[PDB]
Amino acid sequence: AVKITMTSGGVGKELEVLKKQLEMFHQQYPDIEVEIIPMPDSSTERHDLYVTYFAAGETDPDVLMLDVIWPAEFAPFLEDLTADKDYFELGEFLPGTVMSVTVNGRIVAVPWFTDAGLLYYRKDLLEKYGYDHAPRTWDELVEMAKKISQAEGIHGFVWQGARYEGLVCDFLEYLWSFGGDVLDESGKVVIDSPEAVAALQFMVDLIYKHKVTPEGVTTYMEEDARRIFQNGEAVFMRNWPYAWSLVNSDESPIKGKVGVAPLPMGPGGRRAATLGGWVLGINKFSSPEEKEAAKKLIKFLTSYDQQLYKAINAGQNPTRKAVYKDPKLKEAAPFMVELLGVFINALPRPRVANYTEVSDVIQRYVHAALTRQTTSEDAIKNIAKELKFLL
Numbered sequence: 514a515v516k517i518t519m520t521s522g523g524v525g526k527e528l529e530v531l532k533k534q535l536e537m538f539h540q541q542y543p544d545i546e547v548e549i550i551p552m553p554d555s556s557t558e559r560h561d562l563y564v565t566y567f568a569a570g571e572t573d574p575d576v577l578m579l580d581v582i583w584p585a586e587f588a589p590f591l592e593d594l595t596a597d598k599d600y601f602e603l604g605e606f607l608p609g610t611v612m613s614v615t616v617n618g619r620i621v622a623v624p625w626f627t628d629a630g631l632l633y634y635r636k637d638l639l640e641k642y643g644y645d646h647a648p649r650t651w652d653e654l655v656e657m658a659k660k661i662s663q664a665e666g667i668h669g670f671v672w673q674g675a676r677y678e679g680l681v682c683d684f685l686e687y688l689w690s691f692g693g694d695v696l697d698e699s700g701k702v703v704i705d706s707p708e709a710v711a712a713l714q715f716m717v718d719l720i721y722k723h724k725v726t727p728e729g730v731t732t733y734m735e736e737d738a739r740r741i742f743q744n745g746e747a748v749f750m751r752n753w754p755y756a757w758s759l760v761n762s763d764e765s766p767i768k769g770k771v772g773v774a775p776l777p778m779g780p781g782g783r784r785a786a787t788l789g790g791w792v793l794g795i796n797k798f799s800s801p802e803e804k805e806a807a808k809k810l811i812k813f814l815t816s817y818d819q820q821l822y823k824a825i826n827a828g829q830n831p832t833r834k835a836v837y838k839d840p841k842l843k844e845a846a847p848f849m850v851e852l853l854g855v856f857i858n859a860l861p862r863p864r865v866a867n868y869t870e871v872s873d874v875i876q877r878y879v880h881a882a883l884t885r886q887t888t889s890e891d892a893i894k895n896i897a898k899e900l901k902f903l904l
């Protein structure tokens with residue numbers, strides 16, 4: 514009787530799983546009908562779509578699938594949910610995810626699933642070549658990748674190097690593990706450092722010196738790296754947990770041969786993973802009847818049983834604490850439970866209302882360095898300069 518719309522991506526199996534979740538939702542709320550609006554794979558491109566939605570004052574979409582990096586920017590256009598804190602049972606959620614949706618003391622979204630970078634590796638190939646463990650340092654990964662890739666005739670290491678938000682997530686994991694940072698605890702840009710130049714040079718060296726990563730990586734997003742790994746054509750892959758639901762399914766040629774581990778440590782004496790995730794917000798311009806229906810859909814989708822269903826079938830990490838005690842979860846995706854320390858310790862991108870502009874600066878110069886249009890020193894030097902103008 515009440516019609517609402519919801520945006521969704523189509524990466525992996527998430528759209529297929531959502532349709533099934535909506536079918537279960539309609540059994541519980543036949544008075545509400547939901548239409549899915551599909552989105553492009555790129556988070557950067559999705560961001561621009563939302564800007565045009567809010568600029569026009571559109572009453573659709575009603576439920577917004579938002580990247581964890583957007584709440585600070587999009588808070589003026591989102592329904593304030595602070596009074597619904599107990600309605601959504603936010604006390605049951607991972608506290609870090611609730612902090613991500615809190616903007617100036619106001620709750621502007623409900624956490625749906627959380628994310629962190631992980632290392633996928635061909636466990637069969639590592640044992641075949643005398644390695645009983647996942648690489649613990651970046652240098653050990655290169656050594657393993659070099660030896661196995663030329664013996665087997667496949668790529669060593671695939672990741673996300675296209676000029677979009679995914680590149681920033683990959684770059685920060687190298688920057689942080691090498692001992693650098695973008696901003697200090699105050700506002701000051703500190704990215705102009707020898708550690709940052711070394712981190713970016715290492716990414717360049719993976720392609721041109723060590724030759725463990727194909728130059729085509731400068732066009733890869735999440736799914737491009739996933740297919741190459743899934744088809745047995747890469748020893749290592751950096752990606753999010755979702756890829757597990759596909760590379761270990763019955764349709765995968767490498768099912769049962771995939772291991773998951775934290776990303777390796779760097780010269781900074783520490784390993785790091787970029788915090789990711791997606792949250793559900795409500796369009797401020799929707800009618801009050803639509804907002805009420807949207808609240809029921811968001812509560813249903815973020816309930817215990819639905820978070821478990823999404824985790825098992827789409828490989829996306831729950832935001833409710835208690836789901837990690839469920840034996841069904843450990844059965845489907847053991848790394849989600851065993852590597853929980855990775856997800857609570859995942860480092861966030863800078864939380865500023867203009868992050869997408871900060872990300873755009875990082876995208877241009879990092880990608881330019883990966884394609885050899887500039888050097889690592891000039892790239893880092895130009896990032897710092899233009900970031901200081903933004904901040």
Ligand SMILES: OC[C@H]1O[C@H](O[C@H]2[C@H](O)[C@@H](O)[C@@H](O)O[C@@H]2CO)[C@H](O)[C@@H](O)[C@@H]1O
Nearest residue numbers: 522524554556628678679753755789790
């Ligand atoms: O590409 C950057 C983006 O990656 C992650 O989002 C993925 C997610 O992991 C997948 O499960 C699926 O939802 O596709 C998304 C990309 O559209 C991070 O969650 C996100 O924070 C990050 O910006």
Ligand SMILES: [Mg+2]
Nearest residue numbers: 518572573575
């Ligand atoms: Mg509407």
